[model samples]
Target chain A: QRFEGVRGVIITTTEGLPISTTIDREKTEKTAALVTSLVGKARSTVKELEEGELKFLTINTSKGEVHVAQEEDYILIVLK
Target chain B: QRFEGVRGVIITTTEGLPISTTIDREKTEKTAALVTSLVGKARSTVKELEEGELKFLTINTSKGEVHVAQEEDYILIVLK
Candidate 1:
């Protein structure tokens, strides 16, 4: 909201436990859970490939963008 | 202590507010705050160079490595 074009924000653990959110919806809970595992599995997949740690990932759809970032034991998901 | 070879972990905001950590001391609080500003300032500096969003940074000390990563609203610091 404060950030231009940002629709929502979700913060969670790699284990799918939500820590905080700004979406003002129960749906965000499910989203956070799914995203947590998604990011976790993705990171491990990348590591198995002999690359470096996952940093930031941006997925652009025709309508908007989804950004995922990893910080220590947490995962941040932003919708724009 | 969980992460092998990891001496410490610090999480904070870009404005230098400690969020979470596993360093087991008061010193980590100050380190988190300082690192928050350090990472924030570094990201802005790098942006001026037109290199793109600050992604991953690694500091190699004589004795260990310091890794700093930035998510949307957080900064994670790891010392080894």
Candidate 2:
């Protein structure tokens, strides 16, 4: 099935806070590792799923950056 | 030149951070008294101007509200 539509990814903080995010999966993997190493292993997790579940799981992995308190920095990752 | 403008009695936090605030001189005077009474009277001060110094001071006196972190709350006091 080939079509054109905007796919969205929402990354939320641990506090259930909503914000935009930029996704480079390789970069995200590296960043996540750094976060887990510095903070703790239990603080974050990466969910890998089929193409359908990809758009639903919002992942926010920015450290010490606030989305709600400061939302201008948030980047919306769109896949067409 | 007796145009109405937004006015406030200058007030800052102990940490010297700024945010949006409103001006109600009577209310501000009362609030200043309350602030002075709580933290031992050495933390905050009010500036009174005859006519010119009135606009020079920018106050952020919502106790903890931020203008830059969240600048949408800032009230533009325009006098016409």
Candidate 3:
């Protein structure tokens, strides 16, 4: 199922390389790298706390909201 | 007041060094470093999407929840 007011969605490699995106072409790659790095760093914190595997990351900024779903080999980014 | 089930809280430098914490002393230093790095990386993702300044980051795992609040020279991490 999909939600309304979605600004963009991207599926990318765990390494931060883009596979596809619903966002403008100009910034997809840039966003992909950044989110991947973000998820990677986030995952480490979970372990550092001995907390479990990272399941999701929610980011809120003044401009909008970003949600990241982490997987073994890929990442899902939903920008709203 | 503090919430029920709240696990730990840490305030650390932007560079990830510990300032003070509510965590067990044995693990406080490790947790501080990890969360600072997590917030630092999360901030860049916000900029990549041009989503304005990163206001907060929420992380969830099978075991628990972690929250990050970034400040100008420090970061606050709350573990659940």
Candidate 3 residue pairs that clash: none
Tens digit of lDDT per residue, candidate 1, span B2-35?
A: 5676776777786767677776445566666545
Per-candidate local distance difference test: 0.59, 0.24, 0.82
Q: On a 0 to 100 scale, what is the lDDT of residue A16 in model 1? A: 64
The model with the greatest lDDT is 3
Better of 2 and 3 by lDDT: 3
Error of model 2, residue A80, in angstroms: 20
- Please give, as one word, the docking class of candidate 3: medium
lDDT of 2 by residue, A1-80 (tens): 22354332334343333344344454343333322221111111111001111111111221211111112333222222
TM-score of each model's chain B: 0.79, 0.27, 0.81
lDDT of 2 at B13: 44
How do the residues A1-80 of candidate 1 rate in per-residue lDDT, one tens digit apiece?
35776776778887767787876555566666555554554454334322356566543333355567778888887766
Report the Cα lDDT for residue B63, model 1: 42
How does model 1 score on DockQ? 0.02
Residue B45's lDDT in candidate 1: 31
Query: Tens digits of per-residue lDDT for model 3 on B1-80?
Result: 35687787888888888888877765778778767777877877787778889899889888777888988998888887
